[PDB]
Amino acid sequence: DLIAKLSVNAGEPIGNMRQLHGTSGIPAPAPGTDSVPDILDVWRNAQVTLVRSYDWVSRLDTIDNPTSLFPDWSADPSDPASYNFAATDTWVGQTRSIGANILFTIASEIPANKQPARDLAKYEQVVENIVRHYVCGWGDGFENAVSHWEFGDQPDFGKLHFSGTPDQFYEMYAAAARAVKRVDPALKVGGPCVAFPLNEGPFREGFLDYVKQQSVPLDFLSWMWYGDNSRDPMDFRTIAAEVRAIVDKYGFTDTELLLSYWSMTGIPTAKFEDFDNAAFLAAAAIYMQDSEVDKAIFFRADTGADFHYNFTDPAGIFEDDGSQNARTGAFQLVGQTLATTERLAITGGDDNGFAALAGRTADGDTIRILISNYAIPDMYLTARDRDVFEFQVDMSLNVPPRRVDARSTGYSGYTLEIGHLPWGDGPHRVVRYRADRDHKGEMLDSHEGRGSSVTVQNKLAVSGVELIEITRVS
């Protein structure tokens, strides 16, 4: 029995906690998409802070399409009646009602249609009034509902998401950026959602070169990463460092890095245990808290019901019927930890999958200590002959060298000493929540005590996630 030894100083912040708990997916029914469960309250309890809109039925299709935001491209682009906002309005309102911001992805109806825009001038006008609808109340719209506007989704994923040329993609990006900034310079615009971020190409170097040479705004560079071929929660930090270096190389030192998709698996035939995945995503969140990632979108916090490809994506962490499990439990405990504002020092975790993170709320009355015990499986600790991952859709991408020395320490439990509780030595409450092979994030036990220090110990086998919550008792 190997027992990890953790210590937290609860009385002094080391710095600000960074709110990286973004996600994508459909949280509740909307007109025309009413078959999905209502899980919006779970997003609220998880303290989701950012929602990518791409998986909604909220596409700006480049041909005529009833479900598109502009369904008839012959219609008057100045008339609100020409726009189809109803379902998107519902999802925007749902997202704002839980206090989350929106990353609105401007994209065609992938995969049914990936053609570029036929009429760039009209495309630009239509993008601008979509923005005005969600930012300036245009056409019975919202005020300041969408802070981030993304153009693109995996243009380098073969021709499966974009069938135009790179030049056509770049001009479309510039039109969208012009329209967003014309509505409100304070809005953030970016792209292109690189699918293969360690691969040179027209949508990495060629995209950065274009926005530089043509002086196009780029508030964030967006990209994706999945753990399919590593199962290593460290990957997101590793990739972000490399992306940061390439973006800086083009002079874009103020541009943020936005992780538009991240998941243990992104291959639609991937197989995994619920509890392994839960521990992975908690460890990944902890590791990327110290990284070049500035904003992150977990893929995907719903049932995986995909109304574009018309299947159930296994990356959807909820059960088909909306019910909960270890993944949804870990998702909530992570978000609650990331919602603290003052990060606290925790010492004794490691970089081989026993990840720990501590923080306290702004009012000082709640300490949260998040612990994931995750083990990279043995078969993923073998170095590859060649650091390229090949998969069927036949495609290939560059992957980082595997961390062959990152085998789990194999802890079976932990003891945790929290000192200097900030409200003093009076009454406090200790509550523990667990997501593992037997639990879905619910509370396991609790007690009340006194003193400015508290010691907590538990068995916590690999593939388990635990949240320790310490509160002042009134």
Author numbering: 4 to 396, 404 to 484
Provide the publication's sentences verbatim.
A putative open reading frame of 1458 bp (cmgh1), encoding a protein of 485 aa (CmGH1) with a theoretical molecular weight of 53.48 kDa and pI of 4.66, was identified from the whole-genome of strain C. marinus E4A9T. According to the phylogenetic tree, the protein CmGH1 belongs to the GH39 family. Here, we present the characterizations and crystal structure of CmGH1, which showed β-glucosidase activity, instead of β-xylosidase activity, to provide a structural basis for the development, and utilization of the marine sourced β-glucosidase. Therefore, CmGH1 was evaluated for saccharification potential with different substrates, which turned out that CmGH1 showed β-glucosidase activity when using p-nitrophenyl-β-D-glucopyranoside (p-NPG) and cellobiose as substrates.
The crystal structure of CmGH1 was solved with a 1.8 Å resolution. Diffraction dataset was integrated into the monoclinic space group P21 with two molecules per asymmetric unit. The groove distances among residues Phe114 and Tyr312, Pro271 and Leu163 of CmGH1 were 6.6 Å and 15.0 Å, respectively, whereas the corresponding distances in the groove of GH39wh2 were 19.3 Å and 22.4 Å (Tyr210 and Glu415, Asn251, and Asn370), and those in XynB were 5.4 Å and 14.6 Å (Tyr116 and Arg324, Tyr282 and Phe166). Therefore, CmGH1 might be a new exoglycosidase when comparing with GH39wh2 and XynB. The active sites of XynB include the conserved Glu160 and nucleophile Glu277, whereas the corresponding residues in CmGH1 were Gln157 and Tyr264. For example, the β-hairpin motif of CmGH1 extended from the catalytically active pocket and held onto one end, which was not reported in GH39 family. However, the β-hairpin motif of CmGH1 was far away from the nearby small α-helix, indicating that there was no interaction between them and the β-hairpin motif adopted a closed conformation, which might be related to its substrate recognition.
